[PDB]
Write a protein that binds this ligand. Structure first.
Ligand SMILES: *[C@@H]1O[C@H](CO)[C@@H](O[C@@H]2O[C@H](CO)[C@@H](O[C@@H]3O[C@H](CO[C@H]4O[C@H](CO)[C@@H](O)[C@H](O[C@H]5O[C@H](CO)[C@@H](O)[C@H](O)[C@@H]5O[C@H]5O[C@H](CO)[C@@H](O)[C@H](O)[C@@H]5O)[C@@H]4O)[C@@H](O)[C@H](O[C@H]4O[C@H](CO)[C@@H](O)[C@H](O)[C@@H]4O[C@H]4O[C@H](CO)[C@@H](O)[C@H](O)[C@@H]4O)[C@@H]3O)[C@H](O)[C@H]2NC(C)=O)[C@H](O)[C@H]1NC(C)=O
Ligand SMILES: N#Cc1cc(-c2cc(OC3CC3)ccc2F)c(OCc2n[nH]c3cnccc23)cc1Cl
Ligand SMILES: [Ca+2]
Ligand SMILES: [Ca+2]
Ligand code: NA
Ligand code: NA
Ligand SMILES: [Zn+2]
Length: 805
């Protein structure tokens, strides 16, 4: 209940929220149906519009007007944004030449440059170039400030997940806003765009910027604007707040535009009807900048122009229906559209089986436009699993398509021509970033980066300590003139052992065999030196990775590769090797096909054994350093060491063998050598973080050999590919993957064909950042390069996407 007969007199857009049943004049009052009786009259004035005209110049103040053209308006902070242009012969901000802002030029009493976040819903990245002729204000921001060619949103590429990611630096799985619609089974409650339940604070995890600010003594303007408040009024409210006295004035502000998303849904991303919404957004930017200029803040405020996601062409006719696949279609609930999420209609139905639903949705039609996944099998780059609000069954929908339960759901709801929500690496979902101000760089282009990184930077811009988040603080230092955060490398927690030869052959009883009994002082000293690390500079180019948790491991040196061998997991945590452009691929000789060799540096008790694999009818093995890339017949024996073996399902060995036999050499040819680091990952609870021993759910039968959930590789070369990988003087280039270790290739519908038609496609889908691997392994890479640490942090957040331009 609201006693709406209090008044908003002198309280319009009050920052502090007053408590029911006392009536509200703050922004959200509309959304709670709680504004005071006179809120529209006092706070939403529209009289005479939003622009001064010559005849109004120096008028007598009339408090009914939406904005003012009277001599006292500047000191009141409530002039129309074009007041100085119309009435004082000033230029619009957009018509002024741009001039470097070397230092903040702020009015007295400003403690720090304010930050304004100008967020635009549905603003696809390519609009910056394709719409540049109709967006002069935005184009000046872009060209004069710091910009990326695009910014990667998070998955799903929907509004609230992305704007709340911007606010918190967290993946949706951690912040809790995992789509625009959700069911939380602990709460037994549903979150929707419509209605009121979405304002309940239990939906919203982490700590958004406005709370981070407030807790640290920095005042914040509103981040949420009610849909009925027009854009001109949002801008005027921000400008008025900026005119407050020093002790009352916020330091961080947000503007939000529902456009171009609103029109994009109706008309498609490049519909002719899209030109107007872009013109209008640009006009709004013009109003803000003119307003800032009038208040002498245009060379003081840092402005971020940022989108939440892009927009793709999507129509009703490109809809797949689950009713064409499942018989039981009324036993399920689908969250539909540009992604699919499936759960049981009733928890009382114990005849509901996820395995049979997945199988009925897998590779059933030749051009099928969605792919089902148990959430733990989604590409790890999506970070979309560790939340009870994300249903176990997920459908990744192809760009340009929808999924629905039944046809009736589409015509009892063609209207729309645009949508978004798809995989966050899809080009059409990419959105925009521009930063303009004293703290940003001048006329600077930066590479594309992920929106999870911005929270840290916004905290840096405001002198705030960020709450714990998924950004990598320092990775965006290259955007900034000053206020950089100077991170240090994490300390190594576990130092390795360096074992020598400590065991005789006959101490091992592993059930392994190798045809290797084949016998020189020239080559005897030479092989001793390889085992003490004489080739390690060739194979370990960026130093050894640091182990950031407590464990027991050994460094093992060899002619062609170096490894960090875990005594706890009985396999390497990592294996490092360099393949030059010139290297030759060879086969596994006939006599070595089943060869596994005890490693006399490592006890039997901390070794794998061949008998376990013999007895485990589902599990085979592979090697981390590939025998195919041995430098010589003699060196090839090292590749068959039991310490280089890892457990692999035969179906996965098809993938791994093609990667090692064909792809590594291809990449060395294309990139002028590559350094490769490969290893296992264990993420049985799908939290994106390294498992401890006691979290492992599967072992090679009858043994303590833990089975990885995934295998990674990090492939590094010289960005200047005219230099070979192993003699690179400058910046590096990386691509990585985290392949799911699956007992079938059901994910790849064309897997009956030759690996050349499907393996690389799988690997592209599971592309990853080095940082993703770091989380999953507790390893810290690139510890010894000639590069700055901030540059290395940037490299570690790079994602190789495999989209064209
Ligand atoms: C991305 O960045 C984020 C942020 O840094 C990373 O997330 C952190 O990961 C940590 C490890 O997974 C995690 O630490 C745990 O926190 C527990 C306390 O948590 C509460 O308080 C914090 C701080 O204010 C708060 O942020 C949390 O908020 C979560 O939950 C509410 C809903 O209840 C949501 O509003 C919110 O969205 C958020 O949900 C997300 O996180 C939780 C896990 O915390 C998930 O379950 C959800 O799915 C969702 O993703 C909390 O309200 C603390 O109690 C834990 O301690 C246990 O583990 C330690 C290990 O040191 C052990 O020693 C203890 O014994 C203890 O175990 C006991 O409880 C067990 C479980 O009940 C039980 O089995 C044992 O037997 C014991 O009794 C732990 O320290 C941290 O909370 C989150 N933070 C956030 C914001 O998510 C994330 O990892 C990064 N991602 C990547 C890929 O790097
Ligand atoms: N950084 C950031 C940032 C966060 C938000 C946001 C606000 C929120 O407010 C609580 C009361 C729900 C919650 C989550 C958010 F992510 C945001 O919201 C703009 C918005 N105003 N009006 C809309 C209508 N629909 C969708 C979004 C908005 C804009 C930005 Cl720049
Ligand atoms: Ca949106
Ligand atoms: Ca884990
Ligand atoms: Na086997
Ligand atoms: Na298949
Ligand atoms: Zn939309």
């Amino acid at each position: 209940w609201t006693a709406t007969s209090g008044s908003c007199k002198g309280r319009c857009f009050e920052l502090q929220e007053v408590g029911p049943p006392d009536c509200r004049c703050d922004n959200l009052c509309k959304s709670y149906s709680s504004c005071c009786h006179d809120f529209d009259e006092l706070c939403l004035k529209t009289a005479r519009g939003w622009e001064c005209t010559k005849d109004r110049c120096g008028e007598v103040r009339n408090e009914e007007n939406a904005c003012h053209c009277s001599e006292d308006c500047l000191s009141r902070g409530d002039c129309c944004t074009n007041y100085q242009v119309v009435c004082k012969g000033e230029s619009h901000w957009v018509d002024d030449d741009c001039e470097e802002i070397k230092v903040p030029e702020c009015p007295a009493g400003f403690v720090r440059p304010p930050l304004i976040i100008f967020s635009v819903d549905g603003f696809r990245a390519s609009y910056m170039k394709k719409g540049s002729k109709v967006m002069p204000n935005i184009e000046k921001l872009r060209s004069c400030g710091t910009h990326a060619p695009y910014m990667r949103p998070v998955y799903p590429t929907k509004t609230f997940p992305n704007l709340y990611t911007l606010a918190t630096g967290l993946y949706p799985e951690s912040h809790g806003i995992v789509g625009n619609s959700m069911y939380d089974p602990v709460f037994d409650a549903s979150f929707h765009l419509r209605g009121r339940e979405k304002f309940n604070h239990r939906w919203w995890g982490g700590q958004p910027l406005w709370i981070t600010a407030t807790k640290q003594g920095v005042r914040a303007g509103t981040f949420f604007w009610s849909v009925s408040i027009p854009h001109e009024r949002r801008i005027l409210t921000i400008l008025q707040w900026l005119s407050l006295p020093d002790n009352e004035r916020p330091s961080v502000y947000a503007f939000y535009s529902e456009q171009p998303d609103f029109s994009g849904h109706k008309y498609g991303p490049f519909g002719p009807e899209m030109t107007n919404p872009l013109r209008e957004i640009d006009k709004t930017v013009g109003q803000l900048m003119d307003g800032l200029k009038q208040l002498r803040l245009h060379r003081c405020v840092n402005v971020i122009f940022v989108g939440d996601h892009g927009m793709e062409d999507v129509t009703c006719d490109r809809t797949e229906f689950l009713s064409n696949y499942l018989t039981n279609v009324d036993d399920i609930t689908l969250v539909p559209g540009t992604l699919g999420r499936i759960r049981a209609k009733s928890i009382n139905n114990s005849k509901y089986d996820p395995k049979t639903i997945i199988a009925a949705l897998t590779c059933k039609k030749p051009d099928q436009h969605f792919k089902p996944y148990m959430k733990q099998h989604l590409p790890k780059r999506l970070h979309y699993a560790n939340n009870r609000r994300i249903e176990d069954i997920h459908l990744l929908v192809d760009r340009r398509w929808h999924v629905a339960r039944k046809p009736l759901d589409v015509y009892k709801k063609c209207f729309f021509q645009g949508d978004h929500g798809f995989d966050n690496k899809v080009n059409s979902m990419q959105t925009v970033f521009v930063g303009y101000g004293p703290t940003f760089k001048y006329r600077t282009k930066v590479p594309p980066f992920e929106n999870i990184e911005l929270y840290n930077v916004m905290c840096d811009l405001l002198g705030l300590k960020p709450a714990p988040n998924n950004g990598t603080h320092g990775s965006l230092n290259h955007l900034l003139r000053t206020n950089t955060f100077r991170p240090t490398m994490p300390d190594e927690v576990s130092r390795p052992n360096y074992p020598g030869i400590m065991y005789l052959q006959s101490e091992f009883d592993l059930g392994c065999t190798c045809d290797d009994k084949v016998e020189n002082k020239l080559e005897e000293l030479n092989k001793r030196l390889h085992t003490k690390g004489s080739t390690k500079e060739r194979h370990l180019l960026y130093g050894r990775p640091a182990v950031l948790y407590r464990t027991s491991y050994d460094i093992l040196y060899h002619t062609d590769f170096e490894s960090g061998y875990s005594e706890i997991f009985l396999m390497p945590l990592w294996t490092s090797y360099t393949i030059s452009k010139q290297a030759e691929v060879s086969s596994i000789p006939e006599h070595l096909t089943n060869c596994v060799r005890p490693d006399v540096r490592v006890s039997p008790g901390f070794s794998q054994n061949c008998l376990a694999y013999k007895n485990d009818k589902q599990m085979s093995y592979g090697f981390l350093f590939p025998p195919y890339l041995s430098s010589s017949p003699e060196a090839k024996y090292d590749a068959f060491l039991v310490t280089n073996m890892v457990p692999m399902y035969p179906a996965f060995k098809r993938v791994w063998a093609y990667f090692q036999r064909v792809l590594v050499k291809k990449y060395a040819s294309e990139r002028n050598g590559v350094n490769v680091i490969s290893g296992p990952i264990f993420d049985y609870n799908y939290d994106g973080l390294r498992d401890t021993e006691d979290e492992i759910k599967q072992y090679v039968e009858g043994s303590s050999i833990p089975v990885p959930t995934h295998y990674y590789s990090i492939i590094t070369s010289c960005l200047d590919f005219t230099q070979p990988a192993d003699k690179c003087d400058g910046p590096l280039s990386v691509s990585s993957f985290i392949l799911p270790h699956r007992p079938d290739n059901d994910e790849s519908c064309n897997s009956s064909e030759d690996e050349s038609k499907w393996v690389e496609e799988l690997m592209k889908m599971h592309t990853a950042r080095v940082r993703d691997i770091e989380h999953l392994t507790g390893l810290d890479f690139y510890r010894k390069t000639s590069r700055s640490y901030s540059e290395i942090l940037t490299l570690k957040t790079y994602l190789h996407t495999y989209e064209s331009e």
